[PDB]
Write a protein that binds this DNA or RNA. Structure first.
Ligand SMILES: Nc1ccn([C@H]2C[C@H](O)[C@@H](COP(=O)(O)OP(=O)(O)OP(=O)(O)O)O2)c(=O)n1
Ligand SMILES: [Ca+2]
Ligand SMILES: [Ca+2]
Length: 344
DNA sequence: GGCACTGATCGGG
DNA sequence: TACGCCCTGATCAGTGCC
């Protein structure tokens, strides 16, 4: 098999640069402003100049402003980044037997048939692809080219930014050995630690250990997954999957336990979640982010689809029950998730 | 026991 | 210290059933 993985570079920030070339060359930070104050929010992405100063995705905006006070801070414009991505996924399309759009800024392409099976052919194709995206969209990207999906992702990651990473079959068995454990996709930094010290810290190490003492450190799924990787017998197909859920989250104007206060926002979230569903969800979940950023959810799945008007009543019921569960913490952000969709 | 179903928590981009 | 929004599947717990 042959896979071309594609990950757009500092994507949201790079798009703001294509849209405003003055931003290029200088610290730039794309921020999610909660609305609560003029700086409440989280960083979504920073360009590499901003990363040089310590700016990190996920970090609170005021934190970012203490270490990079002269960076440009811009509000997120997700619809524009979504467009950019749609357009690029379309370009990748014509180069792929199959394309699995993994997220807003990355995809896997099975090019086995396209390159007439030849590995080097595919490498050249990876090159032509990086050029097309730069020429057409002025976006730079990192690619990986390996016999499977997981490997293409690993060498791409080691090759950011603007990289063209490559693992040939020849060097697959080697790379898998020299492969550290944390460099593996699908293994949390918690799974890391509790595996890290406790015997395993490299990828060939699961090999020497036995499934028992591992099926309880990470579960059967991850255990078998690592096992297969370690012996180079992993090969999942490139398969595009449809979205299964559609959510909306809002920050409350102020922290509260008062359902009468929260309800209008919850309704607004329901309305906007619904407008994203290409169907009728059979399950609605309510998600409350408490004062301390702890996350509570209550959901309900029916035997039939849920109309929007119905969702309001169910959602208010679920939220009201959540607050019974907690009893003392105010809510900070509220969210709703719609899934188990009856597709049109 | 173990199937079939529902429900809550947690991690990645 | 500081704090958004959105999507995933695994896992485990629970319940009713035969
Ligand atoms: N906590 C996060 C992490 C990521 N994203 C969004 C913005 C990112 O730009 C985009 C892609 O995530 P990446 O991990 O690929 O990060 P970048 O593209 O921004 O940088 P790079 O891939 O060059 O390392 O997803 C986000 O909103 N919030
Ligand atoms: Ca990515
Ligand atoms: Ca990226």
């Amino acid at each position: 098999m042959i896979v071309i993985f594609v990950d757009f570079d500092y994507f949201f920030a790079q798009v703001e640069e294509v849209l405003n070339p003055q931003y290029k060359g200088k610290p730039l930070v794309v921020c999610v402003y909660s609305g609560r104050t003029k700086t409440s929010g989280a960083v979504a992405t920073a360009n590499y100049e901003a990363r040089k100063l310590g700016v990190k995705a996920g970090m609170p905006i005021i934190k970012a402003m203490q270490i990079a006070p002269s960076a440009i801070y811009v509000p997120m414009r997700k619809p524009i980044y979504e467009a950019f991505s749609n357009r690029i996924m379309n370009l990748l399309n014509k180069h792929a037997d199959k394309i699995e759009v993994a997220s807003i800024d990355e995809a896997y392409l099975d090019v086995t048939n396209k390159v007439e099976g030849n590995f080097e052919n595919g490498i050249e194709l990876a090159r032509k692809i990086k050029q097309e995206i730069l020429e057409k969209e002025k976006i730079t990207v990192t690619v990986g080219v390996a016999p499977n999906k997981i490997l293409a992702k690993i060498i791409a990651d080691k090759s950011k930014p603007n990289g063209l990473g490559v693992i040939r079959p020849t060097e697959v068995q080697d790379f898998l050995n020299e492969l550290d454990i944390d460099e593996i996709p699908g293994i949390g930094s918690v799974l890391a630690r509790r595996l890290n010290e406790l015997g395993i810290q490299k990828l060939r190490d699961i090999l020497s250990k036995n499934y028992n003492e591992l099926e309880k450190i990470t579960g059967k799924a991850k255990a078998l997954y690592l096992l297969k990787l370690a012996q180079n017998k992993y090969s999942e197909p490139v398969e595009n999957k449809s979205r299964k859920s559609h959510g909306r989250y809002l920050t409350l104007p102020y922290n509260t336990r008062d359902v009468k206060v929260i309800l209008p926002y919850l309704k607004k979230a329901i309305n906007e979640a619904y407008n994203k569903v290409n169907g009728i969800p059979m399950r609605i979940t309510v998600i409350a982010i408490m004062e301390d950023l702890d996350i509570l959810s209550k959901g309900k799945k029916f035997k039939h689809g849920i109309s929007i008007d119905n969702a309001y009543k169910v959602a208010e019921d679920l939220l009201r029950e959540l607050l019974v569960r907690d009893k003392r913490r105010n809510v900070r952000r509220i969210g709703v998730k719609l899934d188990n969709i009856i597709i049109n």
